[PDB]
Design a protein around this motif. Structure first.
Motif, PDB file in Angstrom:
ATOM      1  N   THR B  41       0.807  -1.217   0.000  1.00  0.00           N
ATOM      2  CA  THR B  41       0.000   0.000   0.000  1.00  0.00           C
ATOM      3  C   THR B  41       0.840   1.266   0.000  1.00  0.00           C
ATOM      4  O   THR B  41       0.378   2.328  -0.426  1.00  0.00           O
ATOM      5  N   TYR B  42       2.030   1.242   0.626  1.00  0.00           N
ATOM      6  CA  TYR B  42       2.872   2.409   0.732  1.00  0.00           C
ATOM      7  C   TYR B  42       3.637   2.671  -0.570  1.00  0.00           C
ATOM      8  O   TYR B  42       4.297   3.701  -0.625  1.00  0.00           O
ATOM      9  N   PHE B  43       3.636   1.748  -1.554  1.00  0.00           N
ATOM     10  CA  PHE B  43       4.471   1.837  -2.733  1.00  0.00           C
ATOM     11  C   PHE B  43       3.614   1.740  -3.988  1.00  0.00           C
ATOM     12  O   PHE B  43       3.956   0.966  -4.907  1.00  0.00           O
ATOM     13  N   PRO B  44       2.535   2.549  -4.119  1.00  0.00           N
ATOM     14  CA  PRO B  44       1.675   2.493  -5.328  1.00  0.00           C
ATOM     15  C   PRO B  44       2.385   2.846  -6.638  1.00  0.00           C
ATOM     16  O   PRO B  44       2.055   2.347  -7.702  1.00  0.00           O
ATOM     17  N   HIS B  45       3.383   3.692  -6.492  1.00  0.00           N
ATOM     18  CA  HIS B  45       4.232   4.222  -7.550  1.00  0.00           C
ATOM     19  C   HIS B  45       5.345   3.277  -8.002  1.00  0.00           C
ATOM     20  O   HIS B  45       6.050   3.615  -8.951  1.00  0.00           O
ATOM     21  N   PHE B  46       5.539   2.129  -7.329  1.00  0.00           N
ATOM     22  CA  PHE B  46       6.585   1.187  -7.676  1.00  0.00           C
ATOM     23  C   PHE B  46       6.031   0.045  -8.507  1.00  0.00           C
ATOM     24  O   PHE B  46       4.956  -0.476  -8.293  1.00  0.00           O
ATOM     25  N   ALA B  57      16.704  -0.116  -6.236  1.00  0.00           N
ATOM     26  CA  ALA B  57      17.162   1.220  -5.857  1.00  0.00           C
ATOM     27  C   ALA B  57      16.740   1.581  -4.432  1.00  0.00           C
ATOM     28  O   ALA B  57      17.498   2.191  -3.682  1.00  0.00           O
ATOM     29  N   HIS B  58      15.497   1.239  -4.073  1.00  0.00           N
ATOM     30  CA  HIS B  58      15.026   1.522  -2.725  1.00  0.00           C
ATOM     31  C   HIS B  58      15.806   0.687  -1.686  1.00  0.00           C
ATOM     32  O   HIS B  58      16.121   1.207  -0.633  1.00  0.00           O
ATOM     33  N   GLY B  59      16.011  -0.607  -1.954  1.00  0.00           N
ATOM     34  CA  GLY B  59      16.846  -1.480  -1.117  1.00  0.00           C
ATOM     35  C   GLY B  59      18.226  -0.920  -0.843  1.00  0.00           C
ATOM     36  O   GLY B  59      18.710  -0.992   0.298  1.00  0.00           O
ATOM     37  N   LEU B  86      10.220  12.167   7.614  1.00  0.00           N
ATOM     38  CA  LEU B  86       9.625  11.558   6.436  1.00  0.00           C
ATOM     39  C   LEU B  86       8.628  10.449   6.801  1.00  0.00           C
ATOM     40  O   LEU B  86       7.526  10.421   6.269  1.00  0.00           O
ATOM     41  N   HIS B  87       9.014   9.512   7.670  1.00  0.00           N
ATOM     42  CA  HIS B  87       8.178   8.336   7.954  1.00  0.00           C
ATOM     43  C   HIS B  87       6.928   8.669   8.793  1.00  0.00           C
ATOM     44  O   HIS B  87       5.901   8.023   8.587  1.00  0.00           O
ATOM     45  N   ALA B  88       7.042   9.592   9.756  1.00  0.00           N
ATOM     46  CA  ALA B  88       5.944  10.083  10.588  1.00  0.00           C
ATOM     47  C   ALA B  88       5.040  11.101   9.878  1.00  0.00           C
ATOM     48  O   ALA B  88       3.838  10.868   9.831  1.00  0.00           O
ATOM     49  N   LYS B  90       5.125  12.791   6.554  1.00  0.00           N
ATOM     50  CA  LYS B  90       4.731  12.598   5.179  1.00  0.00           C
ATOM     51  C   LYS B  90       4.105  11.227   4.966  1.00  0.00           C
ATOM     52  O   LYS B  90       2.981  11.133   4.516  1.00  0.00           O
ATOM     53  N   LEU B  91       4.830  10.141   5.263  1.00  0.00           N
ATOM     54  CA  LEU B  91       4.395   8.816   4.839  1.00  0.00           C
ATOM     55  C   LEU B  91       3.356   8.227   5.802  1.00  0.00           C
ATOM     56  O   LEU B  91       2.587   7.362   5.393  1.00  0.00           O
ATOM     57  N   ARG B  92       3.402   8.591   7.099  1.00  0.00           N
ATOM     58  CA  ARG B  92       2.459   8.069   8.088  1.00  0.00           C
ATOM     59  C   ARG B  92       2.505   6.546   8.133  1.00  0.00           C
ATOM     60  O   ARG B  92       1.485   5.870   8.039  1.00  0.00           O
ATOM     61  N   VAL B  96       3.624  -0.845  13.100  1.00  0.00           N
ATOM     62  CA  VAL B  96       3.639  -2.307  12.956  1.00  0.00           C
ATOM     63  C   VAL B  96       4.564  -2.737  11.811  1.00  0.00           C
ATOM     64  O   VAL B  96       5.218  -3.807  11.874  1.00  0.00           O
ATOM     65  N   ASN B  97       4.575  -1.929  10.740  1.00  0.00           N
ATOM     66  CA  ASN B  97       5.341  -2.279   9.548  1.00  0.00           C
ATOM     67  C   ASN B  97       6.856  -2.301   9.749  1.00  0.00           C
ATOM     68  O   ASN B  97       7.502  -3.059   9.025  1.00  0.00           O
ATOM     69  N   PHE B  98       7.402  -1.536  10.688  1.00  0.00           N
ATOM     70  CA  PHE B  98       8.814  -1.592  11.017  1.00  0.00           C
ATOM     71  C   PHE B  98       9.230  -2.945  11.610  1.00  0.00           C
ATOM     72  O   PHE B  98      10.334  -3.435  11.317  1.00  0.00           O
ATOM     73  N   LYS B  99       8.355  -3.543  12.431  1.00  0.00           N
ATOM     74  CA  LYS B  99       8.549  -4.900  12.928  1.00  0.00           C
ATOM     75  C   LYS B  99       8.631  -5.909  11.800  1.00  0.00           C
ATOM     76  O   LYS B  99       9.425  -6.843  11.899  1.00  0.00           O
TER      77      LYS B  99
HETATM   78  C1  HEM Z   1      14.659   0.033   9.127  1.00  0.00           C
HETATM   79  C2  HEM Z   1      13.633   0.564   8.557  1.00  0.00           C
HETATM   80  C3  HEM Z   1      13.607   1.607   7.492  1.00  0.00           C
HETATM   81  C4  HEM Z   1      14.639   2.371   6.934  1.00  0.00           C
HETATM   82  C5  HEM Z   1      16.110   2.399   7.386  1.00  0.00           C
HETATM   83  C6  HEM Z   1      14.055   3.201   5.902  1.00  0.00           C
HETATM   84  C7  HEM Z   1      14.782   4.122   5.161  1.00  0.00           C
HETATM   85  C8  HEM Z   1      14.267   4.859   4.132  1.00  0.00           C
HETATM   86  C9  HEM Z   1      15.051   5.704   3.246  1.00  0.00           C
HETATM   87  C10 HEM Z   1      16.557   5.899   3.424  1.00  0.00           C
HETATM   88  C11 HEM Z   1      14.179   6.267   2.406  1.00  0.00           C
HETATM   89  C12 HEM Z   1      14.479   7.173   1.195  1.00  0.00           C
HETATM   90  C13 HEM Z   1      14.503   8.545   1.695  1.00  0.00           C
HETATM   91  C14 HEM Z   1      14.897   9.416   0.515  1.00  0.00           C
HETATM   92  O1  HEM Z   1      15.255   9.017  -0.638  1.00  0.00           O
HETATM   93  O2  HEM Z   1      14.798  10.585   0.809  1.00  0.00           O
HETATM   94  C15 HEM Z   1      12.868   5.768   2.748  1.00  0.00           C
HETATM   95  C16 HEM Z   1      11.735   6.048   2.034  1.00  0.00           C
HETATM   96  C17 HEM Z   1      10.507   5.371   2.179  1.00  0.00           C
HETATM   97  N1  HEM Z   1      10.232   4.430   3.094  1.00  0.00           N
HETATM   98 FE1  HEM Z   1      11.369   3.855   4.561  1.00  0.00          FE
HETATM   99  N2  HEM Z   1      12.762   2.883   5.781  1.00  0.00           N
HETATM  100  C18 HEM Z   1      12.405   1.959   6.698  1.00  0.00           C
HETATM  101  C19 HEM Z   1      11.162   1.399   6.868  1.00  0.00           C
HETATM  102  C20 HEM Z   1      10.045   1.578   6.135  1.00  0.00           C
HETATM  103  C21 HEM Z   1       8.854   0.842   6.217  1.00  0.00           C
HETATM  104  C22 HEM Z   1       8.548  -0.213   7.265  1.00  0.00           C
HETATM  105  C23 HEM Z   1       7.982   1.329   5.263  1.00  0.00           C
HETATM  106  C24 HEM Z   1       6.595   0.871   4.917  1.00  0.00           C
HETATM  107  C25 HEM Z   1       6.145  -0.360   4.954  1.00  0.00           C
HETATM  108  C26 HEM Z   1       8.711   2.323   4.543  1.00  0.00           C
HETATM  109  C27 HEM Z   1       8.262   3.064   3.510  1.00  0.00           C
HETATM  110  C28 HEM Z   1       8.984   4.026   2.798  1.00  0.00           C
HETATM  111  C29 HEM Z   1       8.417   4.721   1.605  1.00  0.00           C
HETATM  112  C30 HEM Z   1       7.054   4.552   0.972  1.00  0.00           C
HETATM  113  C31 HEM Z   1       9.377   5.557   1.215  1.00  0.00           C
HETATM  114  C32 HEM Z   1       9.298   6.496   0.015  1.00  0.00           C
HETATM  115  C33 HEM Z   1       9.814   5.683  -1.181  1.00  0.00           C
HETATM  116  C34 HEM Z   1       9.791   6.495  -2.449  1.00  0.00           C
HETATM  117  O3  HEM Z   1       8.864   7.165  -2.722  1.00  0.00           O
HETATM  118  O4  HEM Z   1      10.645   6.447  -3.283  1.00  0.00           O
HETATM  119  N3  HEM Z   1       9.910   2.490   5.116  1.00  0.00           N
HETATM  120  N4  HEM Z   1      12.990   4.873   3.775  1.00  0.00           N
END
Ligand code: HEM
Ligand code: HEM
Ligand code: HEM
Ligand code: HEM
Lengths: 146, 140, 146, 140
Positions: B41-46, B57-59, B86-88, B90-92, B96-99
């Motif tokens: 649900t958080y990645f509709p654009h992927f 790239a995200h990995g 960003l996570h709080a 913007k993305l909300r 639970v998903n971090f677990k």
């Molecule tokens: C250890 C946990 C996590 C780390 C270290 C992490 C780290 C990051 C990083 C480094 C970015 C990119 C920020 C940027 O390019 O400015 C990001 C974006 C994002 N993260 Fe997380 N993340 C984590 C967990 C999660 C989880 C659990 C979710 C949702 C299930 C999530 C969803 C997203 C989304 C949707 C984006 C934006 C991606 C995009 O639009 O390209 N993240 N995260």
């Protein structure tokens, strides 16, 4: 609960390769090390103070084998998890007072252990099926609390 | 909190990951999308198909952020401040998903580093990923 | 699920005094304020930025009334929670993608709100029965995920 | 973490609790024992009947510790250090149980302070009780 025929076959094929003693022993040992409050349930096993003591404890190995054997019974009865685990659900609720969150913790530890043992054969798709199995088991063990 | 012994373990274990952090991050995401379909649900654009370039790239970004964190264990709130926003805000992302991602990352490390993924190392990495998750959800 | 006859009667007697609009509106509003990630599901409601905006938002009140009405249907069908909530379980899983942990959060918020509205009449024993109800509802809404 | 606004709310709300902290602590425990019977396992040595003297005495100690915490919001780890050792090392309390007591404490505050238990105050107290729970489980 909800597996395709092809998923079910992959789950069962992996179980053929599971050594219940080695995997069981490891899974329970890792639970006790990683989530140290779980050690409260096993005071009768003796010294669970450090990781070395836990992983070599013979009561940990034997209990882990029992647990995994029971899990195996679930893997062979995926259409009737509530029936398979009814008696154990009573035991865990009424006699042992285990919070059900701990079943989900053990299920996830078991998945990590399968990953460790099987490597690249424990594919993302196979893990996903195992996540449905472990959640199915955890729910069946929780059934007689609520 | 992370003890000195946990910090040592985490730095040691991450040195064994080394250059594979981005590939592990990508596989952990794939494991999470397949295992836990509500996370998609958080990645509709992927494009979330196997070996999608956007997942790779995200990995990489996830793996690099964890590498950053391992360098800043005494000040995670400071180093990951921008990611907390960003996570709080913007993305909300539901906490639970971090677990779920943490679990998938441990699963991936087990696959690739079976001899190095000892019980003591597993325990230290779990605490590390919890500490990272706490920081990333701290601005709620 | 597991209530005595006397517990069941106390639960139903309190429900007679529940204003679904005031309680519903409050329960949903408090969820959105206290657990701000839940606001992701309600972007169509407009401004949910601060507490004042949330509690006065008419879409929040109307939705909270709907939710509470449905909860009420559960309170009147405690012997068949899985049947009562089957269609809603599908909606929440397949269409809305709500993590089931959020059902338990809303259930507990509702209990806090009942406490606030009923005061010393919301006794420890009556709360305990309501905890079994809210867990029963949460489990029935989760049913079609696993 | 607790923002400055959350700290203000928590100190304000606790001033309204005032001298009732021990009685609220006792009622919260009773609510928890009845609502969540698995929690009774930690208190084999107590008479857990309604208006038990041991429950009233324990409620006092819980209430006083929360009062201490409200005085030390900038250094909870320091102020509650001895309690972190007790709950982790000796008692081995499952972290789930802190959530249950937190809920029961919020329920008790709602009963007794309905006009003061506003949404913003509820939010701040929830964060406070989570921060206290994190400290009390920190030595795992
Ligand atoms: C250890 C946990 C996590 C780390 C270290 C992490 C780290 C990051 C990083 C480094 C970015 C990119 C920020 C940027 O390019 O400015 C990001 C974006 C994002 N993260 Fe997380 N993340 C984590 C967990 C999660 C989880 C659990 C979710 C949702 C299930 C999530 C969803 C997203 C989304 C949707 C984006 C934006 C991606 C995009 O639009 O390209 N993240 N995260
Ligand atoms: C997939 C999850 C689980 C399964 C399949 C399972 C299965 C079993 C089985 C077969 C037994 C033996 C009962 C007998 O001898 O009749 C048992 C006993 C026990 N289980 Fe579980 N278990 C699970 C999870 C847990 C968890 C998470 C804990 C604790 C944190 C726990 C604690 C115990 C204890 C203390 C006993 C009694 C041991 C003894 O008498 O020596 N179990 N369980
Ligand atoms: C006791 C728990 C719950 C009950 C009884 C419940 C019940 C309902 C009902 C009756 C509807 C209306 C469906 C319709 O119009 O056909 C609904 C829709 C919805 N629910 Fe739930 N719900 C619960 C929990 C939640 C939670 C925790 C969330 C989010 C965090 C959520 C998000 C929604 C959303 C976004 C909709 C669609 C709203 C719209 O179309 O305007 N629900 N729910
Ligand atoms: C906000 C949460 C909590 C606070 C502030 C707190 C505080 C305290 C205090 C101040 C003591 C007495 C220490 C002493 O006399 O030396 C104590 C003891 C204890 N606590 Fe906690 N506690 C909390 C949560 C819990 C929970 C969730 C449980 C278990 C369900 C629990 C179980 C116990 C037990 C069994 C004792 C020992 C009681 C005795 O033997 O007399 N506590 N706690």
């Amino acid at each position: 609960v909800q597996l395709s025929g092809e998923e079910k076959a992959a789950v069962l094929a992996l179980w053929d390769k599971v050594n219940e003693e080695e995997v069981g022993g490891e899974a329970l040992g890792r639970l006790l090390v990683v989530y140290p409050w779980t050690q409260r349930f096993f005071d009768s096993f003796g010294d669970l103070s450090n990781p070395g003591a836990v992983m070599g404890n013979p009561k940990v190995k034997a209990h882990g084998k029992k647990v995994l054997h029971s899990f195996g019974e679930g893997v062979h009865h995926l259409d009737n998890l509530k029936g398979t685990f009814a008696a154990l659900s009573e035991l865990h609720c009424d006699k042992l007072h285990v919070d059900p969150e701990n079943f989900r913790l053990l299920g996830n530890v078991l998945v990590v252990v399968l990953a460790r043992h099987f490597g690249k054969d424990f594919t993302p798709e196979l893990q996903a099926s195992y996540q449905k199995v472990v959640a199915g088991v955890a729910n069946a063990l929780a059934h007689k609390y609520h | 909190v992370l003890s000195a012994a946990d910090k040592t373990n985490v730095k040691a274990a991450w040195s064994k990951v080394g250059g594979h952090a981005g590939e592990f991050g990508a596989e952990a995401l794939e494991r999470m999308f397949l295992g836990f379909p509500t996370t998609k649900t958080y990645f509709p654009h992927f494009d979330l198909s196997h070996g999608s370039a956007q997942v790779k790239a995200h990995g990489k970004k996830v793996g690099d952020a964890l590498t950053l964190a391992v360098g800043h264990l005494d000040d995670l709130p400071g180093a990951l401040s921008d990611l907390s926003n960003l996570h709080a805000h913007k993305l909300r992302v539901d906490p639970v998903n971090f677990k779920l991602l943490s679990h998938c990352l441990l699963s991936t490390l087990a696959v690739h580093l079976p001899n190095d993924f000892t019980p003591a190392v597993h325990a230290s990495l779990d605490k590390f990923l919890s500490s990272v998750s706490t920081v990333l959800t701290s601005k709620y």
